[PDB]
Amino acid sequence: ALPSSNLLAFPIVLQDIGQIAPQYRIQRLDSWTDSKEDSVFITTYGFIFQVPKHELLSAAMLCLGSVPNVGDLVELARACLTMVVTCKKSATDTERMVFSVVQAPQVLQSCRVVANKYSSVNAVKHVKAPEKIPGSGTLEYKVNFVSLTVVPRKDYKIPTAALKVSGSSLYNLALNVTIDVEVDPKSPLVKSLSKSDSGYYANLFLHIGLMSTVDKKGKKVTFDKLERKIRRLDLSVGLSDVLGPSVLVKARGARTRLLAPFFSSSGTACYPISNASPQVAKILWSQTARLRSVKVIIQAGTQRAVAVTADHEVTSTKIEKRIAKYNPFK
Amino acid sequence: GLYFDSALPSSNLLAFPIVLQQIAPQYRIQRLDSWTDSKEDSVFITTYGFIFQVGHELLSAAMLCLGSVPNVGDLVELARACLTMVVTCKKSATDTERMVFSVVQAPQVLQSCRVVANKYSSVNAVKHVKAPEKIPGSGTLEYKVNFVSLTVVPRKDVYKIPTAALKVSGSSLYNLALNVTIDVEVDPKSPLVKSLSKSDSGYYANLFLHIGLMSTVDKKGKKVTFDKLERKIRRLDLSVGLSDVLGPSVLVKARGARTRLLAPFFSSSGTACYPISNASPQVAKILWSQTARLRSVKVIIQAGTQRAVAVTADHEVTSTKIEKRHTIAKYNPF
8 A cells, every 4th residue: 555556456455346547667677778679568457347337357467568669658658558458268278368459559569469469368377366257248458557668688588398497417496585565454465475574575486597416527516616606696686577577587697507598698587477476476466566585595406306305595696676666647 | 283263164274374364184075986896996185284384383275186096995094094194395496386295104005196106296386375475485394184085986087188189279170168157155254255256146256168179160061050069069968067086176078979079078988077276276276165066057169269269259059967966065074
């Protein structure tokens, strides 16, 4: 309380039985290296209505893709509001929400969702409460919040398969991230979070790369050595919105050969929380948040071994500026 | 451990932490087998319980499947043994957050089930933990089993469709699907109401399930009509129930022959089983804690590609039979 974004928890909000002002935010990842070839990543947030004649079922999240870093950004956000979108349930291996673009301004025509006229997304990652969405009827999605992020050719989402690579000659590099969330203590959201005296916070565990267990001359890397490599890697970590709430990791120092594919050639990686942990992602649709702590953790490199081998904590990383505030249009 | 008030079933404590602020072990058995015996028969075992932090603090409800043992012994003694298990857990991650359960002690009757044979299982956390965001990614944690749910069925009947055959799409196919609504017994004071549909009777949950594929043409030439498809589907003679094999799941059965496209969506004995925790993790975990039964199941035709679904209204065809005997049943103390 009281940013207007809190309503994006619907229906898990106090007044759930029975448009207030369209908001927008703009985040630059690197305000010093602005280019016309940078991409503007655009996320919508809003509400699924049943067809007043109009019933509020759920908050929902719709990624548009990107557009070149061209034009005035606040007007690009205004165009996101005049978009007309319909959605139905569907399902493939899981429940899907199919959104259809009915109409959209010309400025949005080069992003993937608008170019394709549709988007089909995992419903548990994109809808607050899919159990609430009828399998039939006439449904509508109303965009009320627009969030744009300008990102330099840091392009860098690790392909999912590479996040699942594993083996007994490897360690799994991972981050134990805790996130403070601002919330009304009488909100039902509060139920699923931890309580400290510093406040309510969420826990996230995130796999960030891989390392070798073994020397150039066969066995075997000492912990001290491993931690020196981690230290040199000199991590910084923030919260962002880049097609959904996202964890940004930046190495300011060199990568080892195994860690190298897990970052762009400029030392950055972007992790969509909605794949990492879908319940944390949806919380952050609605509540302001910032990193409480980030500890870097080493675990064995197969889940079988994770089960029998204790984790090695090393150090904290800096917290690198994790984000924009929602504002009304003026 | 901790408590829950006398009015409601203990199974309702499996909502934790989604509860408004004494509990003994329980079991339930579902029989999908015939009354006679065979060694095609297996006992699938699901456990439900709580992850505690030792540093003794209750964090979240959780579910862990163990796999299956042969149908031998006394099933009430098999269930009792499930409580003797020692299980720790910790977070890990690959592409997604993982919960890793480590079986530290297990009784001899379980030694052949998958999770006990290996001494661990590593599961998608959002599907197996009510509130993964409340679990610390370090610290001392234990999984304590309090509910054990057994399902006896022949092995050949638990035909779960592999992910890829469920994504198979096509311009000249129809998406055959089920629109499933589920009545759930829940108290109105319970926080869980928020995410449910208000019924004239009570509360329901909506679930939309992809079930097979059908051709837009008749073999030897197009183009199948409103009426012929109805024919084929009524001939399929679909029946649908709930159960707890591999967690809360939807059982789907066809009495009739399958067309060439539908075949692989059913076993040679016309059965299929869809874990809800894949279709919808949120409905699945509701089902941990509340009793429930099918409210209604309509058969639906959508286009064969997602692109086309988006431009095409759903055509509702018929309802299915509801196996009134197969429901999300309640537990009994030992």
